Design a protein around this ligand. Structure first.
Ligand SMILES: Nc1nc2c(ncn2[C@@H]2O[C@H](COP(=O)(O)OP(=O)(O)O)[C@@H](O)[C@H]2O)c(=O)[nH]1
Ligand SMILES: Nc1nc2c(ncn2[C@@H]2O[C@H](COP(=O)(O)OP(=O)(O)O)[C@@H](O)[C@H]2O)c(=O)[nH]1
Ligand SMILES: [Mg+2]
Ligand SMILES: [Mg+2]
Lengths: 171, 171
DNA sequence: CCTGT
DNA sequence: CCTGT
């Protein structure tokens, strides 16, 4: 098994390319209200979970919900790519505002895997350049995560490692 | 700063080249009796902390002491290079035997810094090739530490980061 | 997907 | 320093 220890007061930030399996992973390990998805927020504001033109509004809503949850001391999982430092920054800041611990969970899978999964999706597929870009951004992000303020940094390096994950929620 | 959370019952495994500052770090952050040094154990068995021919006996003694401490539920820090997977393996197994949390603290410093510190030591020095090899081994070790069984993996990427470290021991 | 060409 | 092959 791959045991990932997290405090009750965690902001768990999933970091991974489109096609890396973030949403599937979130559903497997967490209750629906614990997971706040950027795509779901695109849906909330626009009726379209895949409308990229409303990204600004979607993240405003996501950050607002994250703020309310952490204020109430509720463990929260951010299901978005989080592969740009500028995306992670407000999440860290909000977590610190409410004395919650940022946790990074990185889907460090080969680009080929994500591309194959994307090609086999029966839902929204992205163009190949999106996944190539996201993967490069994810890999460039790994080294600096602790310094950004992530108190726990967990890297998953293969589908086997992802599958072996067990979260251990320390009370 | 750079806060590193560790549970009260931890086996903290320092990972770094000779000259990376492991022993200094251990002295700053932990009780003298919490730190078990491989060089000290070379001294215990042979009178000579620098005698590499008694390495087998020294690590036998170190492992024995670690086992006794974890049996008694006492936090323990291994002050050795730990840059070889074969060195880390038996430590992970002892922690497992006694349900102790293994923690990795990596001194990911440039070889140049370790070489300079080594050159300026007054007590004991190693050959330059040793530090070149230790640094290569340290670097190759980073990716697989979580998979080896280290439940928390902390990488320190500069002297500035090492200096900023504060441990948070959680009851 | 925090928004090609 | 878990001993350069
Ligand atoms: N084989 C395999 N496929 C997966 C896994 N996780 C997700 N998928 C598939 O990959 C596609 C995208 O998964 P999703 O969770 O939406 O990834 P996301 O784009 O990062 O949110 C879907 O068709 C999933 O069924 C996995 O662990 N193994
Ligand atoms: N400038 C500076 N020198 C250090 C630091 N830590 C250790 N040193 C020096 O580097 C040399 C080796 O340090 P030591 O703790 O013995 O490292 P070790 O060989 O990895 O156990 C000693 O002479 C130390 O005084 C540090 O944080 N800053
Ligand atoms: Mg998704
Ligand atoms: Mg030392």
């Amino acid at each position: 098994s791959m045991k990932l220890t997290i405090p009750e007061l965690s902001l768990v930030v999933l970091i991974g390319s489109s096609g890396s399996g973030k949403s599937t992973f979130a559903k497997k390990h967490f209750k629906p209200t614990e997971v706040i998805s950027s795509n779901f927020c695109r849906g909330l504001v626009s009726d379209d979970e895949n409308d990229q033109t409303v990204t600004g509004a979607a993240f405003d809503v996501l950050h607002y919900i994250v703020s309310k949850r952490l204020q109430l001391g509720k463990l929260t999982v951010v299901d978005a790519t989080n592969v740009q430092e500028s995306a992670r920054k407000p999440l860290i800041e909000i977590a610190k505002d409410y004395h919650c611990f940022p946790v990074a969970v990185v889907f460090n899978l080969p680009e080929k895997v994500c591309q194959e999964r994307n090609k086999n999706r029966t839902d929204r597929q992205v163009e190949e350049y999106v996944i190539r870009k996201h993967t490069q951004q994810m890999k460039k992000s790994i080294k600096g995560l602790q310094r950004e303020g992530f108190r726990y940094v967990y890297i998953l390096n293969s589908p086997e490692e992802v599958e072996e994950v067990v979260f251990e929620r320390q009370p």
